[PDB]
Enzyme design. Structure first.
Site, short mmCIF file in Angstrom:
data_model
loop_
_atom_site.label_atom_id
_atom_site.label_comp_id
_atom_site.label_asym_id
_atom_site.label_seq_id
_atom_site.Cartn_x
_atom_site.Cartn_y
_atom_site.Cartn_z
N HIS A 61 0.84 -1.21 0.00
CA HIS A 61 0.00 0.00 0.00
C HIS A 61 0.86 1.24 0.00
O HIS A 61 0.57 2.15 -0.78
CB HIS A 61 -0.99 0.02 1.18
CG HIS A 61 -1.83 -1.23 1.24
ND1 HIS A 61 -1.73 -2.16 2.25
CD2 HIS A 61 -2.80 -1.68 0.41
CE1 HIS A 61 -2.59 -3.15 2.03
NE2 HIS A 61 -3.25 -2.88 0.92
N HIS A 91 5.07 7.37 6.73
CA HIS A 91 4.89 6.85 5.38
C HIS A 91 4.42 8.00 4.50
O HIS A 91 4.22 9.12 4.98
CB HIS A 91 3.86 5.72 5.30
CG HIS A 91 2.51 6.12 5.81
ND1 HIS A 91 2.17 6.05 7.13
CD2 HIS A 91 1.44 6.63 5.15
CE1 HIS A 91 0.94 6.53 7.29
NE2 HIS A 91 0.49 6.92 6.10
N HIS A 93 1.94 9.20 0.85
CA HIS A 93 1.03 8.94 -0.24
C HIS A 93 1.43 9.81 -1.45
O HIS A 93 1.90 10.97 -1.25
CB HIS A 93 -0.41 9.32 0.16
CG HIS A 93 -0.85 8.68 1.45
ND1 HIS A 93 -1.57 7.51 1.44
CD2 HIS A 93 -0.62 8.99 2.75
CE1 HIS A 93 -1.82 7.15 2.71
NE2 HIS A 93 -1.21 8.00 3.52
N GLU A 103 -3.39 13.61 0.16
CA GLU A 103 -4.74 13.19 0.70
C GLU A 103 -5.50 14.42 1.16
O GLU A 103 -6.59 14.70 0.63
CB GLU A 103 -4.52 12.22 1.84
CG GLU A 103 -3.83 10.88 1.25
CD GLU A 103 -4.11 9.72 2.12
OE1 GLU A 103 -3.92 9.78 3.36
OE2 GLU A 103 -4.55 8.71 1.58
N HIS A 116 3.09 11.37 6.27
CA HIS A 116 2.38 11.18 7.53
C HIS A 116 3.31 10.62 8.57
O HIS A 116 3.80 9.47 8.43
CB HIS A 116 1.23 10.18 7.28
CG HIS A 116 0.12 10.80 6.48
ND1 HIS A 116 -0.87 10.07 5.83
CD2 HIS A 116 -0.15 12.10 6.23
CE1 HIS A 116 -1.68 10.91 5.21
NE2 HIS A 116 -1.27 12.14 5.44
N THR A 195 -6.40 6.93 7.27
CA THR A 195 -6.90 7.18 5.88
C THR A 195 -6.81 5.90 5.07
O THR A 195 -7.12 5.92 3.85
CB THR A 195 -6.15 8.30 5.14
OG1 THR A 195 -4.79 7.85 4.91
CG2 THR A 195 -6.20 9.62 5.84
O1 GTQ Z 1 -2.30 6.24 8.64
C1 GTQ Z 1 -2.91 5.13 8.38
O2 GTQ Z 1 -3.90 5.01 7.62
C2 GTQ Z 1 -2.56 3.96 9.23
C3 GTQ Z 1 -3.26 2.75 9.16
C4 GTQ Z 1 -2.91 1.71 10.00
O3 GTQ Z 1 -3.67 0.58 9.96
C5 GTQ Z 1 -1.89 1.81 10.90
C6 GTQ Z 1 -1.21 3.01 10.99
C7 GTQ Z 1 -1.52 4.03 10.16
O4 GTQ Z 1 -0.85 5.20 10.25
ZN ZN Z 2 -1.09 8.06 5.53
#
Ligand code: GTQ
Ligand code: ZN
Ligand code: GTQ
Length: 257
Positions: A61, A91, A93, A103, A116, A195
């Site tokens: 992802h 991470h 996007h 986002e 993020h 998200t």
């Molecule tokens: O930012 C996200 O969507 C996110 C989702 C997760 O399942 C675990 C940590 C995360 O930061």
């Molecule tokens: Zn994120």
């Protein structure tokens, strides 16, 4: 399972995760004219000097840079937060083109990418218990635009060749996330959610106003990653962003006048 394609993307997530259509989903569009300065915000404190990175993982992802969160070491506090939140991972996007990728949007403007930095509230002991709470997480969100290179990002870019496909990881010690921050800590804040599935509504979002610049060459290397696993047909890891969701009964507050 879920992803960003036509048949498994954001418009389908609600069937396995009904909270996708909940009351405080993220991201959102930040209408700069409607955001109000909030004098009750305390100064934001980003304390990353003892941050201890461990590993970088392609999860199919995005990629996560993972931190040792076993001691009190890389914390976010102040601004809208009550107490101390500990960094666990960051991470990004990003898009297939420079015109999209973020986002959150700012007056409907999409940036090329968004970073993020995820932290959990230390009152809850660890991340898993934190995500059972309405104030369990804080995410510091930073926009990326394409222009000059960001030198502090280059160690991430250069390790990506070693984690091209889903499930691959690499050692990633001694990385300093201070090198990813812009000059200004001016920000917008609101309550929202993860998200990606499971889309949990635990997050205080702090979205910095000032983007960082990264080079075209740096973002191009992000777009060489794959969503697929090794030996599977190539599906490039691009456009791994969820679009803006309804604001509902929320206000966005500004830390600056
Ligand atoms: O930012 C996200 O969507 C996110 C989702 C997760 O399942 C675990 C940590 C995360 O930061
Ligand atoms: Zn994120
Ligand atoms: O994220 C995914 O699994 C994905 C799958 C596709 O078939 C096409 C685009 C995608 O972003």
């Amino acid at each position: 399972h879920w992803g960003y394609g036509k048949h498994n993307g954001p418009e389908h997530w609600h069937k396995d995760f009904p909270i996708a259509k909940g009351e405080r989903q993220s991201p959102v569009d930040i209408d700069t004219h409607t955001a109000k300065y909030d004098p009750s915000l305390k100064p934001l404190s980003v304390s990353y000097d003892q941050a201890t990175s461990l590993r970088i993982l392609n999860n199919g992802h995005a990629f996560n840079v993972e931190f040792d969160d076993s001691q009190d070491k890389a914390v976010l506090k102040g601004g809208p937060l009550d107490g101390t939140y500990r960094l666990i991972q960051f991470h990004f996007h990003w898009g297939s083109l420079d015109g999209q990728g973020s986002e959150h949007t700012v007056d409907k403007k999409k940036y090329a990418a968004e970073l993020h930095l995820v932290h959990w509230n230390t009152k809850y002991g660890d991340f898993g218990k934190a995500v059972q709470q309405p104030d369990g997480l804080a995410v510091l969100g930073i926009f990326l635009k394409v222009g000059s290179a960001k030198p502090g990002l280059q160690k991430v870019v250069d390790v990506l060749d070693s984690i091209k496909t889903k499930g691959k990881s690499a050692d990633f010690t001694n990385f300093d996330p201070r090198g990813l921050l812009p000059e200004s800590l001016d920000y917008w804040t609101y309550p929202g959610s993860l998200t990606t599935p499971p889309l949990l509504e635990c997050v205080t979002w702090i979205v910095l106003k000032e983007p960082i610049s990264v080079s075209s060459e740096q973002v191009l290397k992000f777009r060489k990653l794959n969503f697929n696993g090794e030996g599977e047909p190539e599906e490039l890891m691009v456009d791994n962003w969820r679009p803006a969701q309804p604001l509902k009964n929320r206000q966005i507050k500004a830390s600056f006048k």
